[PDB]
């Protein structure tokens, strides 16, 4: 919510932990598996009836936006 | 001394480049040593580019270094 | 008189940097064990300096020229 870099946050973290620090912020590493609870693709679910033409696999998250564009050159690029 | 100087300053040798003329000099040394430059005292551009290319393939073969156009620090080192 | 510049009263910049390194000079007088009511005068600080300029600096929201290109930063240490 303040547009800080990961380098930025890590530096600030080490620094403040030096000063009177009982480790206050959390180390960068723990965020990278702390958002697995907030990003897409984490909470099981289903539908009735089953969803048409949309795979019933749920745990996936971010996906490249081409949806399998056959990479053949001569064809439509 | 042609123009009135204005700023007292004891100059010193640049510690940064400090090598680049030395580098290009050893490079010319190798290029003219693959040639017999004191046996043929004045060669034109053809044998120049020839010696360059064979020397650079030699360096890529034994020490594994690409040829370059300008000599930075690390290439000289 | 359009050329825009900012700087310091050189002497004041000095007295700032020196009043900073006060802590270190005092601790160093403590290691050397040199007396204090007798080290009040015979001091000598050596000053380095440098000056270069940056070419045609890139910036944001300057589609037209706002002379945001050249800068020469004169400094000391």
């Amino acid at each position: 919510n303040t547009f800080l870099s990961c380098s930025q946050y890590h530096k600030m973290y080490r620094t403040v932990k030096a000063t009177s620090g009982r480790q206050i912020f959390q180390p960068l590493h723990t965020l990278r598996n702390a958002e697995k609870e907030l990003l897409p693709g984490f909470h099981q679910f289903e539908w009735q009836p089953a969803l048409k033409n949309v795979s019933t696999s749920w745990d996936v998250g971010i996906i490249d936006g081409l949806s399998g564009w056959t990479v053949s050159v001569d064809d439509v690029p | 001394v042609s123009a009135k100087p204005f700023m007292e300053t004891q100059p010193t040798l640049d510690a940064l480049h400090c090598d680049i003329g030395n580098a290009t000099e050893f490079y010319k040394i190798f290029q003219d040593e693959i040639g017999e430059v004191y046996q043929k005292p004045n060669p034109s551009r053809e044998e120049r580019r020839r010696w360059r290319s064979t020397l650079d393939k030699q360096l890529r073969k034994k020490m594994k270094l690409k040829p370059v156009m300008r000599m930075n620090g690390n290439y000289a080192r | 008189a359009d050329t825009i510049s900012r700087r310091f009263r050189y002497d004041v910049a000095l007295v700032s940097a020196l009043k900073d390194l006060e802590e270190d000079i005092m601790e160093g007088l403590r290691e050397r064990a040199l007396d204090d009511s007798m080290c009040t005068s015979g001091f000598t600080v050596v000053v380095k300096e440098s000056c270069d300029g940056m070419g045609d600096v890139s910036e944001k929201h300057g589609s037209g020229p706002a002379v945001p290109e050249k800068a020469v930063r004169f400094s000391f240490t």
Binding site: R14, T15, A18, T19 | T12, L13, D14, A15, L16, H17, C18, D19, I20, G21, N22, E25 | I4, S5, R6, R7, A17, D20, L21, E23, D24, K48, S50, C51, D52, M54, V57, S58, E59, K60, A66, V67, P68, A71, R73, S75, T77
Partner: protein, 74 residues
């Protein structure tokens, strides 16, 4: 060429008159330029009349033995 004269020329005379070489190069400033850029990127006040004033303020802060000393980093 120039550099060859310089190197085979006077190095002993300099290190005697001075006591070092690398301890007087301008390499430092060439690094510090990076700083300049970034500060202009992220702390200009959007007016060249005020820009350098702000940049200088922040840089001078960034180069105080005081504050780097508060950068223990243990």
């Amino acid at each position: 060429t120039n550099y060859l004269h310089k190197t085979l020329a006077h190095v002993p005379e300099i290190v005697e008159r001075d006591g070092s070489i690398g301890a007087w190069a301008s390499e430092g400033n060439e690094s510090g330029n990076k700083l300049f850029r970034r500060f202009r990127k992220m702390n200009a006040r959007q007016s060249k009349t005020f820009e350098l004033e702000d940049i200088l303020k922040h840089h001078w802060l960034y180069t105080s033995k005081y504050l780097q000393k508060f950068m223990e980093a243990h």
